[PDB]
Symmetry: D2
Subunit: 427 residues, 4 copies
């Protein structure tokens, strides 16, 4: 009836945690999630889309390579590992990541699907957390009791403030695939934003720009179509060492950095930029292309015209000028935002909050005052750019398991980098 | 005393693998013997820069069982450095690290007996099992081991063309290179004979220092071209169970005019290195003509050591059907390795099937005997082709060995890999 | 009225020769061709197809980088060189090569289109060649007199002997693009052969294998889907040095080699093999693919069935078995064959012939007995695998111009390779 | 005597370019003066392995005129080696070859005067032209040159932080490195200060030999990361006339908080090298912990030379706002180059427009004067941005210089390049 911990969302981070926590003698854990199964970014799962991270950043390998949930074992189980060996590609197709997480989810015993947690509270008598769910299929109430909670509810698709009207006219990157036909039949399309999502889509639509007749535009507030910096000395910043350093900085300094370091976690894989460019070059060989590409351009307002068009007021923040552009179809590749879910109100008072009323996460990813309520991927403001990285999932899950059980279930490296991040006098 | 299910004689990579795959198999009682005091693998051609030509998934166990604790990835984890390796992002291990990894695996195993020279092996009719006579090399103690089955991975040995036996005191085989590098760099002139990978790693190493010491640096080989090892992915399907079960459709040794015909599938230099070699000649040449020669299609038929203080190499340019001669003080004979049955095998001579040439006439499941109990690792260049020296096909073979030794599939064996169909097949 | 030389075809080789010969003081040359303009392999000109050779193997640069016909100048003239610089890709799209040769052809003054030469003779009185043309548009006869002739009439699309019936049912690689729609609407397609043409098409059709419903088969007589060997030490074989060596071999030995060295000039760009494999892997993620891929399989016969199908009798030459396969659509990527054109009869007697009744080409590409009748790309049997290489076009054109004018108009390197090809004794 | 249309003072690459582009222009009478006895370009940071970060098309002339005989490709042809370079297939020239190429261009030009130190420059009111006073360095002879216009490409000079002036006798700037390599490798400890490309080429060079000599090898820089130079193709559009004519929309020096903000577009290390550096640390570490440190975000504020026999470096970790100190025997100060106006320019001080800081307030066509007749090469880091030190934008500038010097477009100037639109623009 009582669990050592209850894990509240089931995305890749909690799924990881589940695969890691299943084999631990003396640990009862359970993971709730409101959907019927694992399905991860179904709407940006393009046929030629792959992860930004090598396959060793699967569910378990960075913490335990021997785990049967490893992507390589997965491959062995489907009798295709030898083909994966021949492929010799560190980067899984997103479709395969998904098929693999699904496999892991079927195999696990600790997951409870179709279970929407509606409310969470602290019972002062019992000294434990009380989690109220609703079966999404049947209505049934349940309560789940646990000493510790970990939240990986995920963040949520975000569109600019000035577009909550018109929402039914545009498509947010996340829904791109469902609406891809509806878009290609328009005569002009525009993608708004410069993240990897934005780029994969822009590439997708370019592939067919002379199959259909469209104009393909790309506008963003970002100064450049920048690459995710992936050179090996910078990849050391993704390390326990660096997280310590970053966590220990002043809280303004962190937020300051997180907006200044967007090229460490938000940019476009550099092969794709180049592929896009090479494709514009190839397409141009037939005749001039109807493409427009703008930079430094914030969407300040939009409006819907009579004939069946948008008019996008933008503002060029570097040369301080405003301007107007129009487009039949629109793809809002503006990314995602966390917001503490509804249920958190019930424990809301027991969670520590910072000046901006966000979780005041501690180095061990705890938000309560007693190391029982943890978060996954709500720490961008407090642990830095490494927070959403599937390749630091095992590391977090390992510091979690160390807090939840008393002990270092999975060894957690203290430093792996050749460089030294903070100031350190010699002697 | 007790009769082992199998004994493995020789702890090369192939038996070291079979050891790690054997260890945790329930009711398998087997043991591995080797002379050497621990694991080492050709420490005298192992240059700072060298590395394996296969991805790291062709480690001791992973292509049969990714969950094994003897996996490379796990070694890396246990050593404290998997994040660094994740940053490295390189399918190819440095030969020195493969070496440390194997040593760590061997130190962790329990089924290996080091310092155990095998002197003689016989079949004990009266007991109906094999009798293996060993010397403990550190005590001197003789000892006898009983086994129903033997798996021999003794490994091949350093080889030079017949015509060179008299000068073996002076020329240095590739295995002896690092130990004489300093010696050879003092000569006026060095020549590197043979155009496999060993030769090229060396030729590159020496070219590096050519502007710095005297020398003339020559490269001569019998081969037609300095050909690359064919690494295109359609062709690696031929290193697969399907292609090996295809190769088991008897041309009864017209598979042997195939084995010299399919030269560039298992011999041949790494593409990168060939190009590296070229780019280096280019860079050195920016300072002057390079005293280099590079010949090709040339069999070394005779050799002599002039009173002058130089070799004279008699070469036969085989395509032009024309003979020539060249000279050289230093001489690195990069002509490979060849398998001869060890001493201890006279003891079961009459028990072993022989090929018309006194090669083990290896059966399809790797047995040399009549009753499926004496097996061999990589003495089948003639029976299984270009694929017998590949660390990638190690787990496949060890898996079929354990099906035979055990009677049951222990590690499944992926036959659903190749897109190609290899045999004729009708519709 | 009289020309120093008349150039009979206008493909890339004679077009090159034309750009090179135009600026030479004291040289009157003229190039006839029966089509209305330059259009080069229109039917294999896929959108993502590019040359196998870097852009410095354009019309002129390997002989004169300062020529205004250089691909880079071309780029400058269209005001897009800075974009070509950003692209940083040595390999022109085939579409761009074409647009560029067309540009060069407009610019030239020495080309005569719509002129089919029907007959050629030696006038014994005049001591010169007499070339009879027909204007393809208007019927008009003309005669052109020249001292020397050079023939770059091109080779011709070839299909296996056993298919001259059925010719109207299949598509030869050369016509692929016109018939691409007609093929994609079939339910099964097969490509016959393993050259670069075969591969580009197989890739093309795979891109859409789940857009349409087809089965995509690939069958070839070749042992493997082999790569064109492009490693830099082998690329030295494409050199004056090597051609000397090769030309000087016995004529059986050459033919022998030309069939043994098909991987030097006939194979698939290795990126494409791998791309094809990666695409089979990606496509397979959705469900098993209806693809079949056969090797060592000669098409011995074919026949057309009632319902609307082919039945291809093949013969697996390695395991000596015949078999039968069927396919609605068929793409015959069997390449091309030279045959001396009709007009050569008129000079036929003055040309030297070899044992097999092919031009007995001399080192300077002459076929007459007096160094006045030259060929371009009819020397495979006598100059080797480098014959069709656009990157040796400038070299040939340069030895031609040296013979035609008295003198070395464009310097012709005697050796550029670090290695030495023939036997060469030291002293 | 005669008054030149322009005189160029300093024969760096930029004026060497303008020389080659100027030479064949009809009715342009101009000449170039330099002290040095011939061309050399920083011979003491030029390591066997170094190479340019730009493709070879950014040679002296090709981006303005591919037909020029001063093109690299033509140099390669004239030297007898273009086939080798075609085999090399490498957009990036070795720094030693760029050097030989420029020297060959300069030896072939007629408009350069070497050994011609320019002592003083004045405006002769009475003649209405500029007066340039020179010393012939080999005769001693004073001499005076007249010119309507001056183009100054004197080049910047080696720079160290202010706080180091006292120890300049002991530490070695990157320019002096090869000459003290042997000296520095004898020390216990070496430190490399600065994280541009120079630093990295050096840091790599030294790491190479780290296992071989004593040393501790440190790397410290002010920069936040060891960032790569941004080479993604969408971003190289910003190095283009369009982006430079965009940059000519006055923020009147808010383009100066851009110039430190756009650090990684023109400073920053080659991607490959960063990774190379990492892979080498990895390989060396296979033998032991490496005595290396690498610090970042650290301004060198003070420095001192202890009696002990060591420097003590006072560093300020700027992000952590914390001071520290480190020590080192050897010290390579890889801190770059800075432009100060030369001596001879006092002579036209009142004639030159100055930026509020005594920098030439460079006008849009590169003029420093009021009457469009004194021009400058690469003293505009503030007026034209990240693009002023790029050999790729050399031909662009020399082309606009020759429009001004000449009144007519001599070499067109490609403004139809970028797919991006850079300024705001409405629809
Ligand atoms: C499109 C995209 C692609 C990415 N690709 C990469 C990559 O290649 N490499 C990399 O390192 N990082 C990547 N990231 C970063 C990261 O994976 C995601 O931002 C995101 O965090 C997905 O993981 P998650 O576990 O946090 O959340 P989710 O996948 O959102 O998991 C949360 C789940 O819980 C559910 N839920 C919410 N509330 C409740 C409730 N009360 N009860 C029950 N269930 C609930 C949700 O609907 C969902 O099923 C990517 C991100 C996105 C958005
Ligand atoms: C240097 C080298 C590098 C290679 N790299 C690659 C690669 O990157 N990729 C690839 O696919 N293939 C590679 N190969 C091919 C293949 O790995 C080898 O040729 C060899 O077959 C592998 O070793 P083994 O297990 O057969 O035995 P070995 O490595 O030769 O070792 C076997 C042991 O047998 C012992 N022994 C002999 N007699 C006795 C006795 N009487 N008693 C006890 N012990 C005895 C020896 O002391 C030795 O330790 C490589 C081969 C070599 C030689
Ligand atoms: C599809 C294809 C792709 C290739 N790609 C590459 C590559 O990327 N790189 C490379 O190095 N090599 C390549 N090659 C090799 C080579 O370019 C071709 O095989 C072929 O030789 C084209 O050049 P050509 O000048 O010989 O002939 P063609 O292009 O055939 O030129 C001959 C012309 O003369 C005409 N003609 C014939 N008879 C007469 C007559 N009596 N009167 C007037 N005109 C006549 C023809 O119809 C034609 O216009 C390729 C070859 C093919 C077939
Ligand atoms: C080492 C180095 C490598 C670089 N590599 C690249 C690269 O790969 N890609 C890229 O895009 N950018 C590169 N740059 C950036 C740029 O090329 C340089 O910083 C510099 O501006 C180029 O030289 P310059 O033509 O300005 O003059 P310099 O190279 O400095 O030479 C100019 C000459 O001025 C002479 N001089 C000075 N005073 C007098 C006088 N009174 N009389 C006569 N002569 C005088 C000097 O003797 C010298 O010969 C590099 C820069 C340096 C310094
Ligand atoms: N591996 C994969 O296959 C994959 C695929 C998709 C996504 N992802 C990941 O998911 C996360 C988010 O990716 P994403 O592309 O969805 O989102 P993102 O990187 O947050 O995209 C935000 C983009 O939208 C722009 N934007 C926001 N508001 C705007 C406005 N008003 N006007 C104009 N532009 C505006 C942003 O500019 P600013 O930069 O100024 O905000 C930025 O360029 C990252 O962790 C990323 O790596 C990964
Ligand atoms: N750069 C480019 O974009 C490009 C594109 C297309 C072509 N090309 C060039 O054009 C030339 C020819 O190219 P290609 O692909 O058109 O022709 P090719 O290389 O001559 O193709 C012949 C292929 O067809 C097979 N074949 C012939 N007869 C057969 C039979 N009866 N049964 C089964 N298979 C049979 C051949 O096998 P065998 O090997 O046993 O003969 C071979 O695999 C080359 O110089 C090539 O590089 C270049």
């Amino acid at each position: 009836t009582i669990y050592d911990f209850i894990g509240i969302g089931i995305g890749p981070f909690n799924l990881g945690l589940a695969c890691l926590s299943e084999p631990v003698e003396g640990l009862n854990g359970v993971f709730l999630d409101q959907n019927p199964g694992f399905d991860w970014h179904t709407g940006m799962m393009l046929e030629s889309a792959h992860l930004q991270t090598p396959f060793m950043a699967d569910l378990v390998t960075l913490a335990d390579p021997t785990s049967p949930y490893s992507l390589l074992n997965f491959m062995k189980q489907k009798g295709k590992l030898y083909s994966f060996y021949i492929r010799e590609d560190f980067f899984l197709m997103r479709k395969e990541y998904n098929q693999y997480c699904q496999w892991a989810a079927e195999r696990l015993g600790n997951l409870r699907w179709n279970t929407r947690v509606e409310y969470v509270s602290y019972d002062d008598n019992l000294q434990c957390y009380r989690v109220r769910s609703t079966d999404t299929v049947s209505g049934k109430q349940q309560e789940w009791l646990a000493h510790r909670l970990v939240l990986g509810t995920g963040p949520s698709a975000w569109s600019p403030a000035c577009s909550q009207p018109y929402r039914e006219r545009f498509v947010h990157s996340s829904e791109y695939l469902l609406n891809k036909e509806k878009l290609q039949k328009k005569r002009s399309i525009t993608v708004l934003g410069s993240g990897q999502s934005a780029a994969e889509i822009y590439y997708d639509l370019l592939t067919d720009i002379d199959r259909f007749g469209y104009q393909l535009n790309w506008i963003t507030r970002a100064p450049r179509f920048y690459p995710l910096e992936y050179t090996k000395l910078t990849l050391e910043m993704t390390s326990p060492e660096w997280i310590d350093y970053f966590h220990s900085l002043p809280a303004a300094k962190r937020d300051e950095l997180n907006a200044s370091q967007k090229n460490l976690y938000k940019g476009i894989n550099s092969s794709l930029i180049n592929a896009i460019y090479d494709l514009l070059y190839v397409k141009q060989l037939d005749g001039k292309l109807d493409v427009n590409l703008f930079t430094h351009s914030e969407l300040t307002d939009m409006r819907w015209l009579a004939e069946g068009e948008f008019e996008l007021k933008l503002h060029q923040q570097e040369q301080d000028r405003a301007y107007s552009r129009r487009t039949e179809g629109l793809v809002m590749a503006t990314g995602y935002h966390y917001q503490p879910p509804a249920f958190v109100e019930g424990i809301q008072q027991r969670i520590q909050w910072d000046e901006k009323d966000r979780y005041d996460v501690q180095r061990n990813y705890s938000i309560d005052r007693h190391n029982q309520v943890f978060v996954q991927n709500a720490e961008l403001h407090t642990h830095g750019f490494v927070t959403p990285d599937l390749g630091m999932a095992c590391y977090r899950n390992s510091v979690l398991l160390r807090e939840i059980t008393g002990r270092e279930v999975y060894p957690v490296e203290r430093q792996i980098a050749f460089q030294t991040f903070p100031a350190q006098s010699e002697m």
